[PDB]
Design a binder for this molecule. Sequence first.
Ligand SMILES: C[C@@H]1O[C@@H](O[C@@H]2[C@@H](O[C@H]3O[C@H](CO)[C@H](O)[C@H](O)[C@H]3O)[C@@H](O)[C@@H](CO)O[C@H]2O)[C@@H](O)[C@H](O)[C@@H]1O
Ligand SMILES: C[C@@H]1O[C@@H](O[C@@H]2[C@@H](O[C@H]3O[C@H](CO)[C@H](O)[C@H](O)[C@H]3O)[C@@H](O)[C@@H](CO)O[C@H]2O)[C@@H](O)[C@H](O)[C@@H]1O
Ligand SMILES: C[C@@H]1O[C@@H](O[C@@H]2[C@@H](O[C@H]3O[C@H](CO)[C@H](O)[C@H](O)[C@H]3O)[C@@H](O)[C@@H](CO)O[C@H]2O)[C@@H](O)[C@H](O)[C@@H]1O
Ligand SMILES: C[C@@H]1O[C@@H](O[C@@H]2[C@@H](O[C@H]3O[C@H](CO)[C@H](O)[C@H](O)[C@H]3O)[C@@H](O)[C@@H](CO)O[C@H]2O)[C@@H](O)[C@H](O)[C@@H]1O
Ligand SMILES: OC[C@H]1O[C@H](O)[C@H](O)[C@@H](O)[C@H]1O
Ligand SMILES: OC[C@H]1O[C@H](O)[C@H](O)[C@@H](O)[C@H]1O
Ligand SMILES: C[C@@H]1O[C@@H](O)[C@@H](O)[C@H](O)[C@@H]1O
Ligand SMILES: C[C@@H]1O[C@@H](O)[C@@H](O)[C@H](O)[C@@H]1O
Lengths: 135, 136, 133, 135, 133, 136
Amino acid sequence: SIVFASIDPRSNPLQTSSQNYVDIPGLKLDVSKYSNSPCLTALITLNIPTPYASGNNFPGGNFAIVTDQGEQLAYGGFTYSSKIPENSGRMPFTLVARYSLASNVSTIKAQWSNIRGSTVHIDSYASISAVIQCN
Amino acid sequence: SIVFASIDPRSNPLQTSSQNYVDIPGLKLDVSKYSNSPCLTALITLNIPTPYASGNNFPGGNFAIVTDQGEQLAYGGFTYSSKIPENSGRMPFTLVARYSLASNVSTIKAQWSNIRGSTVHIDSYASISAVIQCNQ
Amino acid sequence: SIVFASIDPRSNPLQTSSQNYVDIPGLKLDVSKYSNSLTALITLNIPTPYASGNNFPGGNFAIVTDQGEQLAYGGFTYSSKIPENSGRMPFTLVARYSLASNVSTIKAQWSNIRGSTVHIDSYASISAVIQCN
Amino acid sequence: SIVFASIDPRSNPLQTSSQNYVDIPGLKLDVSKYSNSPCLTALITLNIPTPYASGNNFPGGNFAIVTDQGEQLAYGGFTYSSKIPENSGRMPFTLVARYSLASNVSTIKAQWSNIRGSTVHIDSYASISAVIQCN
Amino acid sequence: SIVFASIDPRSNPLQTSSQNYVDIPGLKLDVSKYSNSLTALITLNIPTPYASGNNFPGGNFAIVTDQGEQLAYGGFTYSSKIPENSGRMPFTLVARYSLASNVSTIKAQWSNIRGSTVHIDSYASISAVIQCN
Amino acid sequence: SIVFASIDPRSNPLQTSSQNYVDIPGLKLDVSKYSNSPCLTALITLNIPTPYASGNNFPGGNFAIVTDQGEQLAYGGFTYSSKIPENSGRMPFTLVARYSLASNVSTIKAQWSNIRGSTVHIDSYASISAVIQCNQ
Ligand SMILES: C[C@@H]1O[C@@H](O[C@@H]2[C@@H](O[C@H]3O[C@H](CO)[C@H](O)[C@H](O)[C@H]3O)[C@@H](O)[C@@H](CO)O[C@H]2O)[C@@H](O)[C@H](O)[C@@H]1O
Ligand SMILES: C[C@@H]1O[C@@H](O[C@@H]2[C@@H](O[C@H]3O[C@H](CO)[C@H](O)[C@H](O)[C@H]3O)[C@@H](O)[C@@H](CO)O[C@H]2O)[C@@H](O)[C@H](O)[C@@H]1O
Ligand SMILES: C[C@@H]1O[C@@H](O[C@@H]2[C@@H](O[C@H]3O[C@H](CO)[C@H](O)[C@H](O)[C@H]3O)[C@@H](O)[C@@H](CO)O[C@H]2O)[C@@H](O)[C@H](O)[C@@H]1O
Ligand SMILES: C[C@@H]1O[C@@H](O[C@@H]2[C@@H](O[C@H]3O[C@H](CO)[C@H](O)[C@H](O)[C@H]3O)[C@@H](O)[C@@H](CO)O[C@H]2O)[C@@H](O)[C@H](O)[C@@H]1O
Ligand SMILES: OC[C@H]1O[C@H](O)[C@H](O)[C@@H](O)[C@H]1O
Ligand SMILES: OC[C@H]1O[C@H](O)[C@H](O)[C@@H](O)[C@H]1O
Ligand SMILES: C[C@@H]1O[C@@H](O)[C@@H](O)[C@H](O)[C@@H]1O
Ligand SMILES: C[C@@H]1O[C@@H](O)[C@@H](O)[C@H](O)[C@@H]1O
């Protein structure tokens, strides 16, 4: 089966300047109905196709897929090559994780953080999804 | 099930300077066998791993996943951080969409458009794909 | 079904200056059980690579079978000749493979460009969804 | 998925002389977790491989598959050819039904009744099962 | 997936005295959508038939494709030459079919034995479970 | 998935007068590819549509579905209602069992045995089959 959530914050853009991972609002999958099932596995894809980061010390952004119990299943990020980009461009990002559904996990969700004091921004479509299958 | 289409236009590269979204040639999925299936969902992934854009005003490219009825299911894009890039680099791009097959749609396809007068280029492998699963 | 492999080479980063495609260690899927049948949709996710060099550096990646069949390839490059500090350029590649053949392994490979060195020092994955046609 | 129940009343045989359909104890499938699902269908098989009926007026037995709301999805039965069988033999019986799981149905179960005043008997293995699939 | 058909011919019972297999009306499965692919496991359920006659009567049943392929057959007969009142003899038959071919329909057929007349006057079904190998 | 085996021994009919259960030749399912699969269940159907039994003391036949480790998953049988049937009629028989594949078993097979000194006969099509499904 497929589980899916998307956001499109074009009229209310999101941002963070957090050095620690924090939730991206709306990018959460409710997997409660599949919880406590050792024979099920989720393949999760976080797709943030048009992010950017502003700043003056090689700005960038990090992203993670995490459970409601705070377990980090995957992480990665983008950065610019110049210390002070002329105009911080859009740097597509995708991340793929796997999770067994044996535990009482309720939610699988996206998080983000900054780098070198940047501000990360999302102002357009992004999604989190999973394919759930038997082992 | 899996539906898949790829291109590899190395000998006859593709480009667009269209301001409006137009089809990327060859990146279409035929889902007609699954049309009006109320219990099925498609997770669609557009993978353009090696595009670039030429131009002189912070060039880039936009991409979308669209039905044959013109419904835009997802969109996004890349841009460079310099006004006039020294040598427009390859900027990998992936886009993921969801589509309920409770519809009379026959085709899902990839679209692209330019930004600030750029030209977008594909000269190598790219794909569009879907995983089609029962909701239960 | 789902097949999956990941790496996270923080304490011993991976690098290549190979002009020809070479395996990325740890990013291999065993599809043994499904050979001679089914289609696999394969996603290579390298979310945080970079490449060092002084001539428009970048990195190429491929998904290959043990039969030597290149199913997909692509790469990233920088827009400057000599990047100030080669940035992280997220990369994802998606391939398909019919499991009608005698394939056992589907794996990731990488290569350099213009004499670069490609680097992975954090999480990356390869995965497949295997389904009936 | 498969749902399954069996009985083996070798040490506590079951019988009925009811002219109206009544439940066969233990031959019930709980389909609660699949209820209220218009996209799911059950294919149900009732297998009573070794029944017999006693009596003196062409004895036999009837069986049905029914929902907890009393909807009869299938029926059939066996009978002997002689008015007074010398020793009522075992007459294997199987019945197959289909049910959409759109409704709030909880249970799918077996029932039995007599014919011409017989007594129907089960004293060995019998089962009810279903294959549940998406439409 | 499940394909299913049933009949319940109480107000207009069905009968045959045909020595050759003939279709039982209403007991046909449309497998159109699955041709040229998958296996079907097909169950014919005739829970309450009987046969009239005076020379060890009985009835035969088969599962057949529209290509004329007999996938399974079997039948019931009585142990007495002239049954006092031909009793109900439950019948089930199970077949398999690979859907690699161009088949559209899988259906039930029946025939008599030793000049009997076979009868169905109550519920009966044909069904299939269609699955990937 | 489906696993299936059939026989049709018209030219070389099968019989048993064994008091103890023995294998019905040819009616075996190989489930070795599915062994030790904790999340899978098999629904097994033994279909013997046209057996008969000869004998002179209320003859009949017994049938079972058994694993290769000797575990009897289901059983049942037919018998005639007369001591000495005039002409032992064909008595259709079907048996359904469940088997969890959380086991190292490799084969599921059909078995038969006699009753009251009968001989059981199969001279025509018969099958054993399983539908194998994930529990979820
Ligand atoms: C910061 C700056 O953002 C982008 O330029 C914006 C432009 O953004 C639109 O296009 C991008 C794709 O490039 C995304 O879809 C955004 O969500 C869109 O809104 C607009 O916001 C206009 C105002 O209408 O302002 C421009 O500056 C981007 O093109 C630049 O490269 C850069 O990242
Ligand atoms: C080459 C350089 O690499 C990154 O800066 C590193 C920094 O890397 C961490 O952060 C990135 C995300 O940007 C990845 O998660 C790495 O796996 C991390 O290790 C650290 O390694 C520090 C150690 O002092 O060195 C920095 O240079 C990146 O942020 C830069 O933009 C650039 O790509
Ligand atoms: C009424 C009578 O029942 C059977 O004879 C029983 C015999 O039954 C066993 O065998 C049948 C299969 O024929 C079933 O598995 C029963 O559950 C078994 O118990 C035994 O009960 C013995 C005592 O041990 O008594 C016999 O009369 C059957 O064989 C007859 O044909 C008839 O239906
Ligand atoms: C030929 C005769 O048929 C049956 O007796 C019928 C009786 O049939 C009903 O019951 C059977 C189950 O035994 C089926 O459900 C039929 O569909 C029913 O109709 C009735 O039709 C009455 C009408 O007066 O006639 C009887 O003869 C059966 O019970 C006999 O054993 C025998 O096989
Ligand atoms: O940088 C990667 C790039 O390398 C060469 O230019 C190829 O012709 C392109 O299609 C692309 O593969
Ligand atoms: O009564 C049915 C019966 O008919 C003939 O005797 C056949 O040889 C048997 O195999 C069986 O099909
Ligand atoms: C247009 C050019 O295409 C290939 O040569 C890449 O290696 C370069 O980085 C640039 O994108
Ligand atoms: C042994 C005999 O076999 C076939 O000829 C049947 O038609 C008979 O009814 C009997 O079972």
